[PDB]
Amino acid sequence: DIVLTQSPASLAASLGQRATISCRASESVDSYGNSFMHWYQQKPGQPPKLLIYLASNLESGVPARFSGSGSRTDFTLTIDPVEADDAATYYCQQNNGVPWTFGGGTKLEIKRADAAPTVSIFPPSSEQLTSGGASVVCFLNNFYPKDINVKWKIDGSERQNGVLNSWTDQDSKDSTYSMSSTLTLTKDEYERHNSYTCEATHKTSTSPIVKSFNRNE
Amino acid sequence: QVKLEESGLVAPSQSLSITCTVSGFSLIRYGVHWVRQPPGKGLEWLGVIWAGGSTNYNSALMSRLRISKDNSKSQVFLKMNSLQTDDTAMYYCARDDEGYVMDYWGQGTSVTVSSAKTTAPSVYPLAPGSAAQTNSMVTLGCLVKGYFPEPVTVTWNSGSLSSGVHTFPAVLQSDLYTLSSSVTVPSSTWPSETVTCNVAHPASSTKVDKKIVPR
Ligand SMILES: [Mg+2]
């Protein structure tokens, strides 16, 4: 069986610059003058899409900024110039023997200018409270880079138990990330405190971005 | 054109059966591949049934995997047994070229291998904190809580409202998933016009609409 190893695991390239990623085969994928190596692109929530076949051939319909090169055990995929829509994970794939196998994938991040998050906080819905539950939700939207920290405070005291965080994949148009942070409490405990605060720490601003509310009628 | 259909959730003691229904080409002329992808992981080739009807397989899985087909029905079948929780994955079928590429792909079907039971979500509308409206923009939310297995699909205004939407990957907590989505619109859009989140959970055959109303 031929094993494919891709490098790097991830890379970040600015809009309009050049990306090259690599695929190394454990032994030759060459048969009678052709390299049986192929490249696929996968965007979030989509199936993979063929880009390059037999190492260097552009598939019909694929933009000409995509290219491939290599032979034997060493192959590259190049995107030049990179566009926002190229935010995706890329896979090499060989079929010089059965079984067909895939490399482990390389994630391309698009580098853009730093962007501060837009923060919004949401008390539990009336419907959730009537059901006996209480979740407080904080959205931290359209920021860059991806690293961010959220701190929850209840009546001014930090709370970490019961917080679930989730990041989107990178936006295919504006190259930002968003994240949701959900503090889940029992209704019993939610209704024994008055103030709820979501605090976002990001490199873009001094001041942490704070959104808060008081429980009231 | 290639379309996968499968159980959604299977117990680890049972078998997995998935059907790939194809259109626009004939299985007498084209082979069909199976490929899977665990959550957050890479593509893994499962095997292939060629136009002529012979098969090749992933070496590590061959003892518990078989692929077959019915040319006259335009259907390709995958069956797996001796299941493991890391068989939880999106399962794709894809058209062969014979034998160079996978050029057309199905959208994939999610398979979860688990003894936990199907649970429909609660869907909660998230309106801003009680009162007028502060900004030139308003952000609304939808909280999809306590369901199993993945996936759910979520739209806003039946998919007509797509700009300014962020739908976040679900988080798993004690055998149940929770998912949220936000949508940001100009202040003149809401509350003067209706905004509704639409949620579908195929495993429980459930759909829920929630209109976002001011608190
Ligand atoms: Mg792999």
Numbering used by the authors:
A (entry chain B): 1 to 217
B (entry chain A): 3 to 99, 106 to 223
Could you share sentences copied from the article?
HHV-6B's unique gH/gL/gQ1/gQ2 complex (a tetramer expressed on the viral envelope) recognizes the cellular receptor, i.e., human CD134 (hCD134), which is essential for the entry of the virus into the host's cells. The immunization of mice with inactivated HHV-6B elicited neutralizing antibodies, and interestingly, most of the monoclonal antibodies (Mabs) with neutralizing potency target the tetramer. The anti-gQ1 Mab KH-1 and anti-gH Mab OHV-3 have neutralizing activity against HHV-6B, and we recently reported a humanization trial of these murine Mabs as candidate anti-HHV-6B antiviral agents. Herein, the Fab domains of the anti-gQ1 Mab KH-1 and those of the anti-gH Mab OHV-3 were prepared by papain digestion, and the crystal structures were determined.
The neutralizing potency against HHV-6B infection has also been shown for a Mab for gH, OHV-3. The residues 100–105 at the CDR-H3 were not determined due to the poor electron density (underline). The remaining surface is hydrophobic, with two tryptophan residues and one valine residue located near the negatively charged area as well. One tyrosine residue was also close to the center of the antigen binding site. However, the 3D reconstruction with 81,721 particles at 16.8 Å resolution revealed that the Fab density bound to the Stalk part, i.e., the gH/gL area of the tetramer which is consistent with the report that OHV-3 recognizes gH. We observed that anti-gH Mab OHV-3 binds at the stalk of the tetramer and at a site far from the expected hCD134 binding site, without preventing the binding of hCD134; this implies that anti-gH Mab OHV-3 may inhibit a tetramer function other than the receptor recognition; for example, the activation of the fusion protein gB at the membrane fusion step or the direct inhibition of the fusion function of gH. The epitope of the anti-gH Mab OHV-3 has been investigated by Takeda et al.. They revealed that anti-gH Mab OHV-3 recognizes the gH fragment (which consists of residues 272–422), and they identified an arginine residue at 389 as the critical epitope for the interaction.
